[PDB]
Amino acid sequence: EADLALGKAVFDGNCAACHAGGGNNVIPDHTLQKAAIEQFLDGGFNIEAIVYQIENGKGAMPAWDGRLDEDEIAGVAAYVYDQAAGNKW
Numbered sequence: 001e002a003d004l005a006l007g008k009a010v011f012d013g014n015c016a017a018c019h020a021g022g023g024n025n026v027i028p029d030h031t032l033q034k035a036a037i038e039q040f041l042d043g044g045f046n047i048e049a050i051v052y053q054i055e056n057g058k059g060a061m062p063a064w065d066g067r068l069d070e071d072e073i074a075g076v077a078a079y080v081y082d083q084a085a086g087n088k089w
């Protein structure tokens with residue numbers, strides 16, 4: 001169901017590794033923030049754009065293609081989007 005709690009559970013395990021509290025450890029300022037997305041993200045503040053990054057891996061970010069399920073992928077994207085939009089970073 002591309003759930004946010006699912007998305008969180010994924011995030012917490014998989015993404016937090018580099019992005020702890022939306023907190024990009026590799027490129028300090030390239031955080032999971034709305035603003036940071038809208039500047040740095042190529043594809044803009046769009047679910048498509050988010051998902052695409054997570055799938056395919058981009059710059060210094062690993063690809064999650066087939067490592068996460070489709071729903072899982074969608075959930076983590078949705079969650080990140082919700083966090084950003086809501087400012088729950």
Ligand code: HEM
Pocket residue numbers: 011014015016017018019024026027029030031032033036037038040041050053054058059060061062064076077080
């Ligand atoms: C876990 C599956 C995971 C998610 C979710 C995630 C999201 C994410 C987004 C949405 C961006 C864009 C942020 C912005 O535009 O400012 C992004 C960017 C980077 N990530 Fe990430 N990310 C997840 C996992 C990981 C892992 C495990 C690493 C660390 C090895 C990592 C690193 C990075 C880096 C670097 C970037 C910037 C690269 C770029 O977009 O050019 N991510 N991530």
